[PDB]
Ligand binder design. Sequence first.
Ligand SMILES: O=c1ccn([C@@H]2O[C@H](COP(=O)(O)OP(=O)(O)O)[C@@H](O)[C@H]2O)c(=O)[nH]1
Ligand SMILES: COc1c(O)cc2occ(-c3ccc(O)cc3)c(=O)c2c1O
Length: 429
Amino acid sequence: PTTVVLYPSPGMGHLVSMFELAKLLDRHGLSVTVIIVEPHGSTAAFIARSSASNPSVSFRVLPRPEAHAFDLLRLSNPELRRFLLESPPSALVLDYFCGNALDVSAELRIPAYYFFTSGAGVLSAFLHFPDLHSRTAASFREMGSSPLHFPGIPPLPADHMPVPMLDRDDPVYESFLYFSKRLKEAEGYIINTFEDLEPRAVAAISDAALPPNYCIGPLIQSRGGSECLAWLDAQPKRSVVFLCFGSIGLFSSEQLKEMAVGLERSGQRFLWVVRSPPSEPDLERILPEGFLERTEGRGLVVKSWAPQAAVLEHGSVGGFVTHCGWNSTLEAIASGVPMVAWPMYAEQWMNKVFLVEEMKLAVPMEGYDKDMVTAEEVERKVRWLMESEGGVELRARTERAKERAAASLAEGGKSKVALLEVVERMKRG
Ligand SMILES: O=c1ccn([C@@H]2O[C@H](COP(=O)(O)OP(=O)(O)O)[C@@H](O)[C@H]2O)c(=O)[nH]1
Ligand SMILES: COc1c(O)cc2occ(-c3ccc(O)cc3)c(=O)c2c1O
């Protein structure tokens, strides 16, 4: 039995997305072990569920010895060599942030693949970052809107680079230059995208002076959770706008007011997921007075969390006001739900440019790059999604992407092929 070790970087979101790969590989008959490095939700709870529902995927918690996780990982290089010495695996699957482990798989002569959870557009940029880094002395926050030109992808305003990379004189930045440099050294690239979604992007990185790549997705990670599904069932087909903004709420209460006044003034049915403004949520302390009373029946506000994958599959959902996280983008495309981009943190501002300019499966929410998105602008874009001809045209474009996706995944498809290509490649020494 061929054995792989998948090394995600610390964090539940990284773990949950490696596990998806792990099930996939063990679904193609590999003995896979997720290696875990614990931070300082719940890791035990996840090992227990994964172990009870997918017993063939086993875990290996290492003796614990953006920023802290880079230190946690450099220092776990000893302990990771111990586990791989006691049984050499056929292949090692790494996160972008786990490049310190490339040192371990050097000596031990073990083929390393990166599992890249963002699309090939984000990879291109991350792969060509160090080159641009040396062609300029200016950091990206200084460069402002000045173009960064990366192979295969639209010019990207420099200030849409991920925050960690915006200031050169910041130890986090140096690590990203380290992890991006180390991407060249790999045997391969497993990307959670499909070629038809990002064709021009795949092509530029499918270069010879660059390790191969295997686009094997969408890999989607598939009580007040049941309630919003019930209320959804209560709505006419395709009539609800879903606003959901990832794992970290970054809306002030006054920004939440604009959203509510804008949603109220659009007339549209809305399913809106709201977290506590930064330093659980008090909706009537936070939202405009009378809002819940006025809009109940027409919309539902959900504290902190909703079953998003379920929600997006529902036939009552006709539009998605998203923060352009990659998993949420995949989940939206695979249900053919058209999108309004409101990127917020991490690499989402990137995703947004590609989502609006390259892929053309969303429209921006003007003001994401500003202090606040206005009630006016929220209302216009929700009107535009549910009512306008552009919206019907856009919902058409997504429908296509839904099918290019469904096709890429079913037998013979471009991603399915890539999957077996990388699995077979793993079985050979
Ligand atoms: O209320 C919520 C918010 C998010 N998600 C899920 O959390 C993941 C978010 O991952 P993504 O990469 O899109 O964004 P991030 O949270 O990393 O910014 C996706 O699977 C969403 O479907 C969810 O189920 N419920
Ligand atoms: C929820 O799951 C994942 C995941 O599995 C992997 C991920 O890898 C990278 C990013 C990212 C974020 C900020 C940045 O500056 C550079 C890269 C990321 O957000 C991310 C993620 O959200």
